[PDB]
Short mmCIF file of C-alpha atoms and ligand atoms in Angstrom, two decimals:
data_model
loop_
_atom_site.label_atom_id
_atom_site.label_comp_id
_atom_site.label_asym_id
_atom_site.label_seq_id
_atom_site.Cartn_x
_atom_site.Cartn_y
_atom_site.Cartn_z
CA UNK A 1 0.00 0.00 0.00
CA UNK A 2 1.09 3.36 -0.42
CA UNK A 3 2.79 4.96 2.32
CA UNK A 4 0.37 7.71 2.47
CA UNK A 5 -2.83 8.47 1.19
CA UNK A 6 -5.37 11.19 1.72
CA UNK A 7 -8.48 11.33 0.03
CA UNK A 8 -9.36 14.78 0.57
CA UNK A 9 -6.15 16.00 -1.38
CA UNK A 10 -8.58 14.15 -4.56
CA UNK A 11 -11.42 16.39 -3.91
CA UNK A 12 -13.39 13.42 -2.69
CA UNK A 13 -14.47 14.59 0.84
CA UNK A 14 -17.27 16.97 1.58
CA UNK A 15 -16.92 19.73 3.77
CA UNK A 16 -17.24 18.85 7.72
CA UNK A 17 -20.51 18.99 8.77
CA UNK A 18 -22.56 19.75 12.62
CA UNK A 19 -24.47 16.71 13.83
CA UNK A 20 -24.96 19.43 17.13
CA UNK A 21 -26.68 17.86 20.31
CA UNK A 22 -28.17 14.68 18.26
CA UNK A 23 -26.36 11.16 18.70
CA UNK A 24 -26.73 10.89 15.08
CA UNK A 25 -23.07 10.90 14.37
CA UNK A 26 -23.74 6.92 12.88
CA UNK A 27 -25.64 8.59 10.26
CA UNK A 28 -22.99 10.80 9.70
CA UNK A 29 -20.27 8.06 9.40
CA UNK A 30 -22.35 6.37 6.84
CA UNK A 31 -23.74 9.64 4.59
CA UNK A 32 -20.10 10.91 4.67
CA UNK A 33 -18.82 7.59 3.65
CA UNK A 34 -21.52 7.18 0.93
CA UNK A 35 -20.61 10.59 -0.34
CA UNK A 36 -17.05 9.34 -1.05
CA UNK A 37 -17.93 6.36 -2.65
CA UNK A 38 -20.22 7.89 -4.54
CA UNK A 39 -17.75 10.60 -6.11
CA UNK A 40 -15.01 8.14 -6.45
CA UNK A 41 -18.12 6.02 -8.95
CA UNK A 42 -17.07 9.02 -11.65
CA UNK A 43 -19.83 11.82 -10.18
CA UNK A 44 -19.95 14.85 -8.73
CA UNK A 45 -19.01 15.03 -5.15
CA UNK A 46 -22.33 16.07 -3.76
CA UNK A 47 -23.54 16.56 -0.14
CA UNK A 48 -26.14 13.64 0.99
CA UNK A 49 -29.15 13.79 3.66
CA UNK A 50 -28.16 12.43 7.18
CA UNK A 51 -31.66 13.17 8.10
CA UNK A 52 -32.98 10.68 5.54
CA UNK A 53 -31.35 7.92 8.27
CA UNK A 54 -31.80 9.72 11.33
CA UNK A 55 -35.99 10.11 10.83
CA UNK A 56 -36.43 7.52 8.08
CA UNK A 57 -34.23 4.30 9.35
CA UNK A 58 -36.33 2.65 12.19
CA UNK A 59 -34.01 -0.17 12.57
CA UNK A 60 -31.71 2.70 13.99
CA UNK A 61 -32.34 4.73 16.96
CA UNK A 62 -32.20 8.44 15.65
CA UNK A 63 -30.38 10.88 18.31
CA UNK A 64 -29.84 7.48 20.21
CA UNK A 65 -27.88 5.91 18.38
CA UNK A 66 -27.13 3.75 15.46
CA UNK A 67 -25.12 1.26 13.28
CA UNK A 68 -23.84 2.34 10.17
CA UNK A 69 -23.83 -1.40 8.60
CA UNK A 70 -27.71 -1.08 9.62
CA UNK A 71 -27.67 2.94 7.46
CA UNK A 72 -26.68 1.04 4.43
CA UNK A 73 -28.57 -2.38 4.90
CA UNK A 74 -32.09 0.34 5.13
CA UNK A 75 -30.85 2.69 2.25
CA UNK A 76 -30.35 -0.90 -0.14
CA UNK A 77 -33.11 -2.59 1.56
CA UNK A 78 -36.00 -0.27 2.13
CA UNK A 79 -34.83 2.74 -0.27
CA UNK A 80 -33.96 1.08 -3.38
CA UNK A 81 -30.37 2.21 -2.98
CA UNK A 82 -31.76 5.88 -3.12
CA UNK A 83 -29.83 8.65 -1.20
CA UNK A 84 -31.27 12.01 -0.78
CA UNK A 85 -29.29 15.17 -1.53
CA UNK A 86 -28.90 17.53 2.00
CA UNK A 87 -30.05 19.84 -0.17
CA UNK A 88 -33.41 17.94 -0.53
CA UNK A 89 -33.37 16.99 3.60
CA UNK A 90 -31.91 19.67 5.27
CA UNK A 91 -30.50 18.38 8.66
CA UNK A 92 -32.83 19.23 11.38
CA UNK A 93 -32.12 17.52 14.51
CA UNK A 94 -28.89 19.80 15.91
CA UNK A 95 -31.48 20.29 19.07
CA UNK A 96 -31.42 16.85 19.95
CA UNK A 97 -34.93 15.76 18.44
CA UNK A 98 -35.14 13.97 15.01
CA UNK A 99 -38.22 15.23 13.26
CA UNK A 100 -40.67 12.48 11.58
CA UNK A 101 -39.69 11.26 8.46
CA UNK A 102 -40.69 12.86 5.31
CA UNK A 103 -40.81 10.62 1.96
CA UNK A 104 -41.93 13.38 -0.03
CA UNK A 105 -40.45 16.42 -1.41
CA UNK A 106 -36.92 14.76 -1.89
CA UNK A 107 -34.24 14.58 -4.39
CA UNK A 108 -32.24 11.48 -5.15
CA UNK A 109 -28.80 12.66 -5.11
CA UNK A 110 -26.94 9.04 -5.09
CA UNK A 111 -27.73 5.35 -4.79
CA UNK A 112 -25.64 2.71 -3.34
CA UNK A 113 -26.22 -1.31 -3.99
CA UNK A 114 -24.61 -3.04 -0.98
CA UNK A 115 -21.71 -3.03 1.53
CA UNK A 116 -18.38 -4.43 2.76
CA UNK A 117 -17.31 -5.05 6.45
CA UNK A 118 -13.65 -5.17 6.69
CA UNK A 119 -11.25 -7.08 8.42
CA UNK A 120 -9.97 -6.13 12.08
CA UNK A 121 -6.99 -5.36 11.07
CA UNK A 122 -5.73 -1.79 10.51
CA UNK A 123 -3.48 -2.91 7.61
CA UNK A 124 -5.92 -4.37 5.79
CA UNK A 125 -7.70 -1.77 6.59
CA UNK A 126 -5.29 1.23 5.03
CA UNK A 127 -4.58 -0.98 1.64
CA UNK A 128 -8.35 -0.91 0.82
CA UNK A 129 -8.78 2.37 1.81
CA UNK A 130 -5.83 3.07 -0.34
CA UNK A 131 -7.76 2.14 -3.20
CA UNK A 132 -11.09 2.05 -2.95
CA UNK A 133 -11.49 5.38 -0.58
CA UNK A 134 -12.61 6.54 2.54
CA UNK A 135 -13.94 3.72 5.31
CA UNK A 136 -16.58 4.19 7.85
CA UNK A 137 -15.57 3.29 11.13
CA UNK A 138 -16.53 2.54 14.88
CA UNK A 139 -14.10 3.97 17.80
CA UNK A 140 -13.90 5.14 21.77
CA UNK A 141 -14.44 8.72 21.06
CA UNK A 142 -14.60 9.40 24.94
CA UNK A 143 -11.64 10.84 25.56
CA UNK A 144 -12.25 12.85 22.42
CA UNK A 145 -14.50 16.29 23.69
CA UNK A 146 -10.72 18.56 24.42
CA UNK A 147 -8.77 17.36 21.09
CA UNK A 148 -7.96 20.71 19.48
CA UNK A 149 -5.08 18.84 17.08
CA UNK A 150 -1.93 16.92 17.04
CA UNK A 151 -2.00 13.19 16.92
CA UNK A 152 -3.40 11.17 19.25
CA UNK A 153 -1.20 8.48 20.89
CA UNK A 154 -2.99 7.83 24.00
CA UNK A 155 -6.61 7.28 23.30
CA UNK A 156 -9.30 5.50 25.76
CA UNK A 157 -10.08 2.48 24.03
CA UNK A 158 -12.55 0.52 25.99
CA UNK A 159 -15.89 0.50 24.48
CA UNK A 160 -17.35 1.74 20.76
CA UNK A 161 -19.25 5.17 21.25
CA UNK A 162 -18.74 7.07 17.84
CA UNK A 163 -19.29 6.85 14.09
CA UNK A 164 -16.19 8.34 11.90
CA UNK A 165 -15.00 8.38 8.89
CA UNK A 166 -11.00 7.59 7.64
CA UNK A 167 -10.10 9.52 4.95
CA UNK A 168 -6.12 8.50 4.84
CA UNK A 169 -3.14 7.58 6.64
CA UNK A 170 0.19 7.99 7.05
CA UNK A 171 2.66 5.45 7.80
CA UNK A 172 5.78 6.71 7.52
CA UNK A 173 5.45 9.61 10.26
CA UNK A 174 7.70 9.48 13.42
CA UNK A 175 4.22 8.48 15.00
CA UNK A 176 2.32 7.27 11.95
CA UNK A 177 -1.47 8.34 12.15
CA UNK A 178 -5.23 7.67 10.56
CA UNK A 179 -6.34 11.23 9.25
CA UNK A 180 -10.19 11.23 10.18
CA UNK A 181 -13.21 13.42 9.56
CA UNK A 182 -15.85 13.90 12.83
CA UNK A 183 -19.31 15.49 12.42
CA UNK A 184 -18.38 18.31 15.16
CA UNK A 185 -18.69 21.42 13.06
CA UNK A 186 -14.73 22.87 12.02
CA UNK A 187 -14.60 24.40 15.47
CA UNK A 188 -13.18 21.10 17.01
CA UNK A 189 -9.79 19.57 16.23
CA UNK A 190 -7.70 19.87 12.68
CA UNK A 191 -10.46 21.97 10.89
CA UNK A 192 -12.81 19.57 12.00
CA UNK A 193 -10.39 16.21 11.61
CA UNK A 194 -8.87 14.47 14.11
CA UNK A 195 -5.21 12.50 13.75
CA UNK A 196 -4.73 9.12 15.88
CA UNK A 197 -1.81 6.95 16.32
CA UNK A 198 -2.04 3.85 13.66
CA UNK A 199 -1.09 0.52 14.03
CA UNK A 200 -1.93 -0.02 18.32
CA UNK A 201 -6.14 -0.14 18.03
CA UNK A 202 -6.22 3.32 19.15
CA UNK A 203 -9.87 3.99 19.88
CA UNK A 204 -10.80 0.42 18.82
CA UNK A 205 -10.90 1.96 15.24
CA UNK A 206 -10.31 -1.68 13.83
CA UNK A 207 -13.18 -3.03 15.33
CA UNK A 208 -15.88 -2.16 12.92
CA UNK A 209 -14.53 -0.77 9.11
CA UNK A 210 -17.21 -0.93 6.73
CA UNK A 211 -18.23 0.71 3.75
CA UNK A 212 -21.00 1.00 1.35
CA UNK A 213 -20.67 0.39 -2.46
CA UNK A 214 -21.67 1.95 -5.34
CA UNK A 215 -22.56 0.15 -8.77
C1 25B B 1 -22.89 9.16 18.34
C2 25B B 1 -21.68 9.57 19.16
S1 25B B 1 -21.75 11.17 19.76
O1 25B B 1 -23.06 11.49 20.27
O2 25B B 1 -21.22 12.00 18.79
C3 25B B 1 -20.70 11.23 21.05
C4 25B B 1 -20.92 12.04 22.15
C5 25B B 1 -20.00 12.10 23.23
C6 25B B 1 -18.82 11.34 23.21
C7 25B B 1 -18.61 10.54 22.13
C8 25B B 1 -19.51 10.53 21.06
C9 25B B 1 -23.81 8.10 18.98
C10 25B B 1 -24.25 8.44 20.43
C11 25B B 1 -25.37 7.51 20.84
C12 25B B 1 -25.89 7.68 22.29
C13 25B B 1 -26.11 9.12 22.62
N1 25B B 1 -23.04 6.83 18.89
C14 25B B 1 -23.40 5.75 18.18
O3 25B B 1 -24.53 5.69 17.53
C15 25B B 1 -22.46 4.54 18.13
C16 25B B 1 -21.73 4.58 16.77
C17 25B B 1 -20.78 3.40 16.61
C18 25B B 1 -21.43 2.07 16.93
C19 25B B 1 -22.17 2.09 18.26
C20 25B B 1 -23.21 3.25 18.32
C21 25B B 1 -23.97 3.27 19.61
O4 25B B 1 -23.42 3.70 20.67
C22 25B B 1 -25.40 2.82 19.62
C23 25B B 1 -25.97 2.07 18.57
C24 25B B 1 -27.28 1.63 18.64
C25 25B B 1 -28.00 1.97 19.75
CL1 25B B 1 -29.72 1.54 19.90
C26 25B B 1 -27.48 2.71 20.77
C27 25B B 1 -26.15 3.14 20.72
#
């Protein structure tokens, strides 16, 4: 794999976005990572409707909580692939209470057919991100609410609280690192990215890689 790689240097990562006092950052782990795949298909990089799975996907718990294996399963399974533009579903749960869903008055702005789970294995990991793009993932995001940049090398890593999504890595670093957008407006971290140590489970970010495919 390459020694480096970061996908927003390609143009293929939206801008950070504000999931505000919702626990809807699952939805934002899966949109985000849909909104990569989708550009790297050969389209437009376009920004997609986190509200579509935060009032729309009752297999997931809205502000709650969610999976984001469970986002894409509902998008292919009870959405015919169909992804809404934000445009089209303007986020509106930053209070902390998902609205009802809406089918109408939407705009299909991408469509996915399935998706991969990973292996646990950071590696493996970084060499398909390498070339098939950015990678939703699962980590420890406790420790996570004073991180105003740098790389993280000690990170609590004892239980799966947050959605993310790696956009690259870098290996060869004196402390080599996963580059990683959150959903907690630019205001936080590295313009709204976070760096953690690679290759020691930092955060549990191995755990649960996925990411949704588009045909
Ligand atoms: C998003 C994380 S957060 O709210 O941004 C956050 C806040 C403070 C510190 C760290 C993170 C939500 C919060 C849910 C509860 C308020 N997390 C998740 O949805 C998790 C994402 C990864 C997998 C596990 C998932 C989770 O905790 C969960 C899934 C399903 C259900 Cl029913 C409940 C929880």
């Amino acid at each position: 794999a390459p020694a480096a790689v970061d996908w927003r240097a390609r143009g293929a990562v939206t801008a950070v976005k504000d999931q505000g006092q919702c626990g809807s950052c699952w939805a934002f782990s899966a949109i985000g990572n849909v909104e990569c795949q989708w550009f790297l298909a050969g389209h437009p990089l376009t920004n997609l409707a986190e509200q579509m799975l935060v009032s729309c996907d009752k297999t997931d718990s809205g502000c709650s909580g969610g999976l984001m294996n469970n986002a894409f399963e509902w998008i292919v399974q009870e959405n015919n692939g169909a992804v809404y533009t934000e445009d089209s579903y303007p986020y509106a749960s930053g209070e902390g209470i998902s609205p009802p869903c809406t089918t109408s008055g939407h705009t299909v702005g991408a469509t996915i057919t399935g998706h991969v789970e990973l292996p646990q294995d950071e590696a493996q990991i970084a060499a398909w991100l390498a070339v098939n793009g950015p990678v939703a993932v699962a980590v420890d995001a406790s420790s996570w609410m004073t991180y105003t940049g740098g790389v993280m090398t000690s990170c609590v890593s004892e239980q799966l609280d947050h959605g993310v999504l790696l956009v690259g890595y870098n290996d060869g670093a004196a402390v080599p690192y996963w580059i990683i957008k959150n959903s907690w407006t630019t205001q936080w971290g590295e313009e709204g990215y976070i760096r953690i140590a690679k290759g020691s489970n930092q955060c549990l970010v191995k755990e649960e890689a996925s990411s949704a495919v588009v045909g």
